[PDB]
Amino acid sequence: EDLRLHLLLNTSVTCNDGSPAGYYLKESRGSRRWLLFLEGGWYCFNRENCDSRYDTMRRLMSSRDWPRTRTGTGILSSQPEENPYWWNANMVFIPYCSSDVWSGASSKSEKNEYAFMGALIIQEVVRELLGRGLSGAKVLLLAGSSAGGTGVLLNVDRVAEQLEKLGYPAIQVRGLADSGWFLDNKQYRHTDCVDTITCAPTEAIRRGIRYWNGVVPERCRRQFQEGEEWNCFFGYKVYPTLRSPVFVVQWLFDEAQLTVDNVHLPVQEGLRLYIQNLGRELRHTLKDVPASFAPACLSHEIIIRSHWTDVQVKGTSLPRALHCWDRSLHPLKGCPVHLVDSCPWPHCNPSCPTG
Numbered sequence: 477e478d479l480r481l482h483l484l485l486n487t488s489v490t491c492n493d494g495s496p497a498g499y500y501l502k503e504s505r506g507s508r509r510w511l512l513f514l515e516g517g518w519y520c521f522n523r524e525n526c527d528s529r530y531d532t533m534r535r536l537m538s539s540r541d542w543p544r545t546r547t548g549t550g551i552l553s554s555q556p557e558e559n560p561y562w563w564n565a566n567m568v569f570i571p572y573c574s575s576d577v578w579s580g581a582s583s584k585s586e587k588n589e590y591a592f593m594g595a596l597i598i599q600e601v602v603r604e605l606l607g608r609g610l611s612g613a614k615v616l617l618l619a620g621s622s623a624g625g626t627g628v629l630l631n632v633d634r635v636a637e638q639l640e641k642l643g644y645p646a647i648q649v650r651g652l653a654d655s656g657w658f659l660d661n662k663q664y665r666h667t668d669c670v671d672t673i674t675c676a677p678t679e680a681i682r683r684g685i686r687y688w689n690g691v692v693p694e695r696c697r698r699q700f701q702e703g704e705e706w707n708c709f710f711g712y713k714v715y716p717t718l719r720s721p722v723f724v725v726q727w728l729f730d731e732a733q734l735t736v737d738n739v740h741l742p743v744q745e746g747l748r749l750y751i752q753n754l755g756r757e758l759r760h761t762l763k764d765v766p767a768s769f770a771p772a773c774l775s776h777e778i779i780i781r782s783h784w785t786d787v788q789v790k791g792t793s794l795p796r797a798l799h800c801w802d803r804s805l806h807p808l809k810g811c812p813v814h815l816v817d818s819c820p821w822p823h824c825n826p827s828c829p830t831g
């Protein structure tokens with residue numbers, strides 16, 4: 477139970493219910509690498525659905541019941557057997573307690589039942605870590621899964637700008653977005669946005685941004701402009717606007733993408749063609765993403781799972797691809813960084829997770 481909780485010293489930076497946000501840290505002295513991981517877990521976007529989330533997913537809205545430690549797993553493990561890539565790094569797990577895809581900048585107040593402070597939580601964590609050793613860093617990798625992966629895309633350049641303005645231009649900020657690269661595609665079956673379950677992510681995120689006071693990266697904001705900032709929550713639209721190196725991990729048939737497309741799994745022709753087209757579209761969006769790992773599996777998240785080393789694309793595991801990415805940022809013979817499956821159906825890669 478090896479990462480220790482620190483509640484933020486700035487207690488105006490809060491989870492949804494006004495309790496302090498925080499982070500779990502395991503230092504590795506003498507390492508100048510820092511991994512800051514953003515937890516995922518969907519989002520809520522109005523009073524009613526945030527109230528329901530508060531009843532049955534309260535750890536995602538409050539720190540009051542957080543344990544004092546958490547065990548680092550997968551890319552957060554300190555054992556080389558489990559984490560060939562960054563086992564000796566300084567490890568930070570940032571709990572997701574803002575329900576805003578890490579985008580919010582609004583406090584609980586007279587007018588707001590909940591605080592949505594995800595973008596400010598990340599900034600405050602970075603600020604407080606600087607005094608605990610991050611000031612000596614050479615690389616800060618901001619990683620995250622699901623909504624935390626999208627959170628990487630929305631925040632990595634802001635972390636880079638923050639460190640530059642604080643006088644640390646030597647810290648190289650990079651992103652690792654896992655299972656956060658979604659498509660605003662047509663659903664397999666179609667429902668108008670009449671409640672939470674019928675509301676597609678484009679409409680739910682458009683509402684969320686207003687409810688959260690959500691913020692997006694500046695260059696993407698300037699492209700899409702007022703009322704269209706929801707576009708910046710879709711990886712293929714925001715990624716080309718970013719300056720920081722970002723490695724994208726995305727299952728081609730992500731279970732959360734299928735859920736928001738109203739697919740849940742003998743498959744007949746219409747659905748077969750739908751699923752094949754989804755994988756093709758995902759592969760197309762990654763064509764020109766040089767650092768990516770996109771296996772042809774029906775699954776969800778990878779990087780903090782203990783068996784994250786097992787999956788391979790073209791014979792290369794994700795820890796290997798990440799190591800090759802590090803080398804590339806110092807093509808490399810036998811050390812690839814762009815790994816996208818071409819086979820067209822879930823589990824056509826034999827190394828997919830078994831479930």
Ligand SMILES: *[C@@H]1O[C@H](CO)[C@@H](O)[C@H](O)[C@H]1NC(C)=O
Nearest residue numbers: 486487488489596597599600
């Ligand atoms: C606390 O965080 C708030 C919100 O991000 C910020 O405005 C303020 O400057 C911070 N205060 C301190 C003392 O760091």
